[PDB]
């Protein structure tokens, strides 16, 4: 058989939400920044032997359109919370994203994964330990990724799928 998941990628502008999604879907990376309004992708994958359609909503990093934001969170089955390891503000935003998801879902138990992107860059401002500790406090997985080298890209999305699968079947 097959399953299907609505994955939503959120996080501050410029952290690499689109680059991560394009690496997962299309297996390439470009340095050029094309700021997102909203994009959706669909891809059939096999994760742990189980075939699934991934529907990926790539959102814009913006804080002005709360009604749209809330609808993305209402429909999403799991969330990648993305920050960049060289963008301290993006890490400080992470707790806001989680609070917003909990508010919309009216729940403390929502599938999500914390993603520290741009791990290839030597300009780090956010320590790995600080991100690990935050994710542990939320009870969610943490993974460091690079859309440029592809490190951790499949693992980030597949980990989120596993979080959803567990939630559904428990």
């Amino acid at each position: 058989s097959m399953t299907e998941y609505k994955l939503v990628v959120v996080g501050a502008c410029g952290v690499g939400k689109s680059a991560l999604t394009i690496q997962l879907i299309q297996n390439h990376f470009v340095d050029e920044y094309d700021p997102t309004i909203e994009d959706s992708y669909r891809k059939q994958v096999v994760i742990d032997g189980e075939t699934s359609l991934l529907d990926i909503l790539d959102t814009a990093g913006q804080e002005e359109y709360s009604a749209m934001r809330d609808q993305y969170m209402r429909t999403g089955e799991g969330f990648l919370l993305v920050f960049a390891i060289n963008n301290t503000k993006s890490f400080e935003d992470i707790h806001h994203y989680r609070e917003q998801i909990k508010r919309v879902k009216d729940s403390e138990d929502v599938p999500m994964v914390l993603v520290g992107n741009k791990s290839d860059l030597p300009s780090r401002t956010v320590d790995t330990k600080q991100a690990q500790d935050l994710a542990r406090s939320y009870g969610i997985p943490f993974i460091e990724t690079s859309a440029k080298t592809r490190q951790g890209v499949d693992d980030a999305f597949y980990t989120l799928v596993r979080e959803i699968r567990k939630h559904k079947e428990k």
Binding site: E32, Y33, D34, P35, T36, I37, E38, D39, E64
Partner: protein, 165 residues
């Protein structure tokens, strides 16, 4: 004392679409109006001519003005890369309002947008400095090349631009 008017000859994949003219509110927003005027004549050696309307979203706006990177991220003012928000006297009252695009407070460059509807949630955040005079029908046509994510179905460019007498 009369506000200046500038014109944009719009093209679709290089073929003429029509002309849009704008009144620039030099009387109430002088620094912002002067930037757009000078970018429209090209008198500083750079400006709008040849650049695209890269982001068009039906029901909302037509946005353009990136003549430095040609990818929606660039542009620059006659005063430097960015200049401060001059005032917020004027509001996004309906179709044809001309307003500055930005990336937050005090980041005006060259990118701008033409409202195709009232966009009042931008009041106090984007500096309104002009309006369409003639050619709203051309703006309505440009709007039809847009889409929900802003990508255009053909290349919409400012083939010529300048100041009217």
């Amino acid at each position: 004392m009369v506000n200046p008017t500038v014109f944009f000859d719009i093209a679709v994949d290089g073929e003429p679409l029509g002309r849009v003219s704008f009144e620039l509110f030099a009387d109430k927003v002088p620094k912002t109006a002067e930037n757009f005027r000078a970018l429209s004549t090209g008198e500083k050696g750079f400006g709008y001519k040849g650049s695209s309307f890269h982001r068009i979203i039906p029901g909302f706006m037509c946005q353009g003005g990136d003549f430095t990177r040609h990818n929606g991220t660039g542009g620059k003012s006659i005063y430097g890369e960015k200049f401060e928000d001059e005032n917020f006297i004027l509001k996004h009252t309906g179709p044809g309002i001309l307003s500055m695009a930005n990336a937050g407070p005090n980041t005006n460059g060259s990118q701008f947008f033409i409202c195709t509807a009232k966009t009042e949630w931008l009041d106090g955040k984007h500096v309104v400095f002009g309006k369409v005079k003639e050619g709203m029908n051309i703006v309505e046509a440009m709007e039809r090349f847009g889409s929900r994510n802003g990508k255009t179905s053909k290349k919409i460019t400012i083939a010529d631009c300048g100041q009217l007498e």
